[PDB]
C-alpha cells in the first residue's frame, strides 16, 4: 500500500487554527482503532480537524474532511525527493506524486518521477502556487517499522512538509 513516513508533516486545521502535524501525530489524534487485513485504521477524531487540500480543477487550496488515518507495516523502500530551494519529501516507491507539466498536474508513481520535474509549493499567506524543480532523487531502505496514510474526502491531495502539494 501507498504511504508516507510518520515524520512527514501535513497541513491541517485544528479547531479553526492552521498548523502542521506529523502523520504519526495525526494518527494519534484519532481513535477507535481497528486492526484488519494487516493494517490499523482509525476513523473517530479526538479534535475538530480538517485537512488542507489542493483542488486542481480550480487551482485553489480548500479544506476537507479526513475520513480515516492508517498505520501499516513498512514493506517497500521509500523514495526521497530533494527540491530546488532545499525542501524535501519521502513516499513509498509506488505512491502517486503530482508533478506540474504544461499547465496541469500529472499523477506519476514515485519511481517514475525524474530530476527536473516540477513540484508545486504553496505560499501559505497568499495561497499562491510556486514551482520548484526536483534536484535529486534517492532510494531509501525502509527506516521504521510502520508507515502512515490518510484518506481525505473528495480531493485526495495534501500539503506536506515545506508546503508541498502532493497526492494523498
Ligand atoms: Zn471520497
Numbering used by the authors: -1 to 166
What does the paper say about this structure?
We solved the three-dimensional structure of the PhoPol-II intein at a 1.48-Å resolution by molecular replacement. The crystal structure revealed the typical HINT fold with the β-strand insertion commonly observed among inteins from thermophilic organisms. In line with the loop minimization often observed for proteins from thermophiles, we could trace the electron densities for all of the 168 residues without detecting any flexible linker sequences, which were present in the structure of the PabPol-II intein. The relatively short helix of the PhoPol-II intein is rather reminiscent of a canonical mesophilic intein. Not surprisingly, the server returned the PabPol-II intein (2LCJ) as the closest structure, with a Z-score of 22.7, covering 164 residues with 1.5 Å-RMSD for Cα atoms. The largest difference between the two inteins lies in the flexible 19-residue sequence at the HEN insertion site for the PabPol-II intein, which is likely to be a remnant of HEN degradation during evolution. The sidechain of the C-terminal Gln166 in the PhoPol-II intein shows clear electron density, allowing the measurement of precise distances with other key residues. The distance between His154 and the carbonyl group of Q166 is 3.4 Å, which is shorter than the distance (4.6 Å) between the corresponding atoms of His160 in block F and the last residue, Asn172, in the PhoRadA intein structure. It appears that His154 stabilizes the side-chain conformation of Q166, making it less reactive towards the side-chain cyclization of Q166.
